[PDB]
Amino acid sequence: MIVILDNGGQYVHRIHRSLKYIGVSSKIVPNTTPLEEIESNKEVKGIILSGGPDIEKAKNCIDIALNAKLPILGICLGHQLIALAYGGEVGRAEAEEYALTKVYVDKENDLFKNVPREFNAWASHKDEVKKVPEGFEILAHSDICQVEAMKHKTKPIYGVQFHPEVAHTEYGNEILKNFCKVCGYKFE
Amino acid sequence: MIVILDNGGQYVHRIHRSLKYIGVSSKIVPNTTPLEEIESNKEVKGIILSGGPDIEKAKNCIDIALNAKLPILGICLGHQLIALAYGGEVGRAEAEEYALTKVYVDKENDLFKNVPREFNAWASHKDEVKKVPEGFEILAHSDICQVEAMKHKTKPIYGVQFHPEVAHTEYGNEILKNFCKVCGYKFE
Numbered sequence: 001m002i003v004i005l006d007n008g009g010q011y012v013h014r015i016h017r018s019l020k021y022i023g024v025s026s027k028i029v030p031n032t033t034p035l036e037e038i039e040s041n042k043e044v045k046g047i048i049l050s051g052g053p054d055i056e057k058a059k060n061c062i063d064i065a066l067n068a069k070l071p072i073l074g075i076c077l078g079h080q081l082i083a084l085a086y087g088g089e090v091g092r093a094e095a096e097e098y099a100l101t102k103v104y105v106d107k108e109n110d111l112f113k114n115v116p117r118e119f120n121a122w123a124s125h126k127d128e129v130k131k132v133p134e135g136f137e138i139l140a141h142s143d144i145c146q147v148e149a150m151k152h153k154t155k156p157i158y159g160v161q162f163h164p165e166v167a168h169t170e171y172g173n174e175i176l177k178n179f180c181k182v183c184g185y186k187f188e
Numbered sequence: 189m190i191v192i193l194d195n196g197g198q199y200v201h202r203i204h205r206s207l208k209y210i211g212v213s214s215k216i217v218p219n220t221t222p223l224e225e226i227e228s229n230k231e232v233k234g235i236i237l238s239g240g241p242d243i244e245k246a247k248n249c250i251d252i253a254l255n256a257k258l259p260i261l262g263i264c265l266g267h268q269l270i271a272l273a274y275g276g277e278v279g280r281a282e283a284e285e286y287a288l289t290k291v292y293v294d295k296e297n298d299l300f301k302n303v304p305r306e307f308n309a310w311a312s313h314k315d316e317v318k319k320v321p322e323g324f325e326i327l328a329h330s331d332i333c334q335v336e337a338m339k340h341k342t343k344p345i346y347g348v349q350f351h352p353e354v355a356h357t358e359y360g361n362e363i364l365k366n367f368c369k370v371c372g373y374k375f376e
Contacts (some may be wrong), residue, residue: 010227013255015225098224098228168222
């Protein structure tokens, strides 16, 4: 089972629905759920930090990103929270409205197994990672954003700026599946 | 603006025309249009699910009915699709041909503000809501149909079995206007 920290965004139920389409169970929990409670449940195999409105309003996610042992995927706000946690920089950017964005995969790692090298993703660039933390690498970019996806170079910590959980993101469910594979799930 | 999901019926342009007559702009879209693309457009204030021929051919409507935050009105197939989405039952009924039907308003809430208690409506009863979903209430009925109109008890989700968009439906435009009032529009 995958625990989804609800950072209060509009696509949190989509994460659950999209995981259900590939056979993976998940539980949406408050973003204040302590890490010890998450990791002591032996049913939990990974954590997703969801999108939401306010980077200041999701600081328990910083503790989770730093200290979790389980694999972690941050989506949009979640990707930004992971960057801040590890000392990278986040700030405002121009293209705030939701749009289809052509993403270019720089390193297949994982997120992008069995995904083409270019695909269109549903994304909002109101905020973005300005500086990738130390010991992280960029995995994908777009014409308007240098960091559409990143991961830690050796730990199972991943971030995407776009939303894989919505239908407009081509191969979104396969990106989710790849994260679930890191969490130990098997797929035929 | 109101988005109209085109379920392939013969009165879809009538919805747009009738809305224009009361000063409300609308855009007819494919019934496969994802909910995220609808709700991310800040000009959209509500959603109408149109009539059409095939309840199996309009399941993106079920996702919309379940998960939209914007007000929704379903017309004939649309009303049926909303019932099915929330766990009610739909099935065949006798009076399949289009006819003028005398509709009795049981609860004004809403659709029927500034509408008389009884009025004649253009309707086909090939299919009908056999069991209103849990958490819904009936608003209107006829001699041959227990559920001429329904709504969710607290959410802005509405269904009508008849076509308010056609001229033969008395006060049709006022029913549409009432839905538009729930969507934030002002008249007077």
